[PDB]
Amino acid sequence: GDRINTVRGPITISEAGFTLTHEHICGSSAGFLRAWPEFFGSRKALAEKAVRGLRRARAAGVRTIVDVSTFDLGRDVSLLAEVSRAADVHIVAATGLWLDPPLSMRLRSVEELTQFFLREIQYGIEDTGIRAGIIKVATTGKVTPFQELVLRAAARASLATGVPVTTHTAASQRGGEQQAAIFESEGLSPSRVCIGHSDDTDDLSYLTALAARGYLIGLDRIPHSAIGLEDNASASAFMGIRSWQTRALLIKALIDQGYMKQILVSNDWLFGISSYVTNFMDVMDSVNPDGMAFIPLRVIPFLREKGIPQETLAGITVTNPARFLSPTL
Amino acid sequence: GDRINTVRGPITISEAGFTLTHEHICGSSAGFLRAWPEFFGSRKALAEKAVRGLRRARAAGVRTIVDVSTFDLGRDVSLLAEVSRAADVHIVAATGLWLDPPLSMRLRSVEELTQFFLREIQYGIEDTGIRAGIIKVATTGKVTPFQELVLRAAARASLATGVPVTTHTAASQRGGEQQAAIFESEGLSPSRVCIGHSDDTDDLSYLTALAARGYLIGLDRIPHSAIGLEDNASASAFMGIRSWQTRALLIKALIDQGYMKQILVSNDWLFGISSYVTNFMDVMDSVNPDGMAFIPLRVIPFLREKGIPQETLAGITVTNPARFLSPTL
Ligand SMILES: C[As](C)(=O)[O-]
Ligand SMILES: C[As](C)(=O)[O-]
Ligand SMILES: [Zn+2]
Ligand SMILES: [Zn+2]
Ligand SMILES: [Zn+2]
Ligand SMILES: [Zn+2]
Known part of the structure; x- marks a missing residue:
């Protein structure tokens, strides 16, 4: 499994960088x-x-x-392909289901969901022939019965194809622990799973325990902060009011505890958003003008200043993703 | 003043039939x-x-x-256009929102929903150039705050364009009353509005009182009957236990009250369905093998044999729809 699907086609994992x-x-x-x-x-x-x-x-x-x-x-995906080519940046696309499934999804069985996820990985998304290289799922803190079906479907798709699973959690409610339990009941390896939005909490006991079990830990919303925007309720609700430095220190925290190999770092950024309040993209860009460049431009120097070795940062930003994305049975 | 938009372009009133x-x-x-x-x-x-x-x-x-x-x-609409051309049957497409709006719709204001409905009528649906000739809305009995927004946006779109509004109601909860009140508060003429699924109830006083106020009465679920079977946890809750003859007699009842010009009749049929239980299309087809031909093949002769003259049935199936659909202010 040294090749992964991108929206421009299969690439060798050494090309991911x-x-x-x-x-x-x-x-x-x-x-x-x-x-x-x-x-x-x-x-x-x-x-x-x-x-x-x-x-x-x-x-x-x-x-x-x-x-x-x-x-x-x-x-x-047709949009992803277009911008991937024009920017000349690899984009890996996802299958799975997030927190807004429509009726035609909500009413489906675990078997049906499994077939849909398998379709988007093995056949293609819609009629584009573009294949997903990852499965994304999301749960409320307490996993609903439908969400549990989605997690079991994701696990079975992962086991059949070797592509990884990444999750959305309510980190303040330790959502990963219930996800992990469902995943492992399906025989799925924790090394195929990233528990995401994990920088949304400062509970290190929760994070290290998951990492200790082999889970990838997604510290993936580093630039999200409504500090200075407390009067904007929607901004506070969405981004929280912990500083980006607070979020970034969890990367150091987990390195310091010996879990450098379980860390995955990201911005959770976007260039448009209709699934929140109107004009919110402007609020976000007002807070983080660097956009997706925030990790390499701001967070990487911050970690180096704190004394984390270049080789460590490189393993996290390059080696961990490659081992994670590489289809692995 | 005349034309009705279809998926193949504008047609004149006389063409609709x-x-x-x-x-x-x-x-x-x-x-x-x-x-x-x-x-x-x-x-x-x-x-x-x-x-x-x-x-x-x-x-x-x-x-x-x-x-x-x-x-x-x-x-x-690309599907509608394909099947309309191949079958040589006119199809009028709809804008509006039903009972499953995604998050990107649910968060929108009445002003934004009005823009969306207006773009589907005035500009076209997606990138197809095909324009909606009707606005469809739905409420669940007690109108939710979002549903009220939809209804007001629908009224504002209708008022700007003259295209009519048609609704889905919980008729057993007399839902059409709360709908009418909202519409009227917006300055919408009841003659631009069809209150649908009205054959879901036997309460003729409810129906007649609406008809008296100028509303069109949509008796559009005549073939929806799951009778003989008090054991389907899906088909009985969805189609009810009243005969189709019972539903169809409501047409007679309203004609006798003198309200023939405000009756609209349909099947509410379809050829595929994913927004319910798997294979529910097979259940529906077994119940009504005639599909969309149920109204002309079964209901029309039934009414004719109850004494309803041909010119009256023609008024209902040809004249009433033309007047309803022809954009008017
Ligand atoms: C689509 As999100 C804000 O839950 O990463
Ligand atoms: C799609 As329906 C059963 O609400 O008319
Ligand atoms: Zn998320
Ligand atoms: Zn995200
Ligand atoms: Zn309906
Ligand atoms: Zn319908």
Whole structure:
């Protein structure tokens, strides 16, 4: 499993390089971008903004991003392919389901969901022939019965194809522990799983325990902070009010505890978003003008200043993603 | 002043003919048909089924159907256009929102929803250039805050364009009353509004009181009958336990009250469905083998044999839909 699917086709994992493991071109809903592109100004404006952002990220060293947008997050792979080519940055696309499944998804069995996930990995997404290289799932703190079906379907797709699973958690409710339990009940290896949004909490006991079990730990929202924007309730609700430095110290914390190999770092950024309040993309860009370049431009020097070896940062930003994304049975 | 938009372009009132005013090619979810066409066997198979179904309805006298599938019912106007051309049956497409709006819709303001409905009517659906000729909305009895927004946006779109509004109600909860109040508060003429699924109840005083206020009464679920079987946890809750003759007699009842000009009749049929339990399409087809031809092949002769004159049935199936659909302010 030394080759992975990208929206431009299969690449060898040595080509991935510096990889951001949790990003989005656009945060939306199924069908929404094509039915109402004017919500984003235009489809063209959105594509142009993504190309400019990805190009600047590439200038900073990024060579690959994993777009973890699912069907129900409005994933438009044709858009991902277009901007990947124009920016010349690898984009790995996802299957799976996020927190907004429509009826036609909500009512399906674990067997059906499994077939859908397998379709997008082994056949292609829609009629594009583009194949997902990862499975994205999301749960509330307490996993719902449908969400549990989604996790079991993800595990079975992973076991059949070797592609990894990445999750959305409510880290303040220690959501990963319930996810991990369902995953392991399906015989799935923790090394195939990233428990994401884990920088949303400062509970190191929770993080190290998961890492100790072999789980990848996603510290993937480092630039998200509504500090200075406390009066904006939606900003506080979405990004929290812990500083980005606070988030970044968890990377050091986990290195210091000997878990350098379990860490995955990202921005959780996007170039448009319709799945939150109107104009929110502007609020986010007001806080983090670096966009997806925030990890290489701001976080990497911060960690070096704190004394973390270059070789360590390189293993985290390059080696961990490659071992993670490489289809592994 | 005249033309009605169809998936093949504008048609004149006289071209519409026998019109079924509440139907579906496929009941699904946004993005679903194109992301998982195998759920329906294949897109090709679904299309072939719809064309045969439309051709049979056509041979039974039908010339136009109104597909009231909204964005969130997974309306695929490219499919409607294909099957309309192949069957030579006019199809009117809908805008609006049903009961499963995704997060990118649920967070929107009344102003934004008005823009979306207006773009589907005035500009076109997606990138197809096909314009909606009806606005479809739905409430669940007690109107939720979001649903009230949808209804007001629908009224504002209707008022800007003259295209009519058609609704889904919980008729057993007399839902059409709260809908009418909202519409009227917006300055919408009741003659621009059809209150649908009204045959879901036997409460004629409810129906007559609405008809008296100028509303069109949609008796559009006549074949929906799961009788003889008090043991299906899906078909009984979905289709009810009243005979179709009982539903159809409501047409007679309203005609006798003198309200023939405010009756609209349909099947609420479809050729694929993913927004319920798996294989529910087989259950429906077994219940009503006639599909969309049920109204002309079964209901019309039934009414004729109860004494209803031909010119009255023509008024209902041809004249009432033309007046309803022709954009008017
Ligand atoms: C689509 As998200 C803000 O849960 O990473
Ligand atoms: C798609 As329906 C059963 O609400 O008319
Ligand atoms: Zn997330
Ligand atoms: Zn994300
Ligand atoms: Zn309905
Ligand atoms: Zn319907």
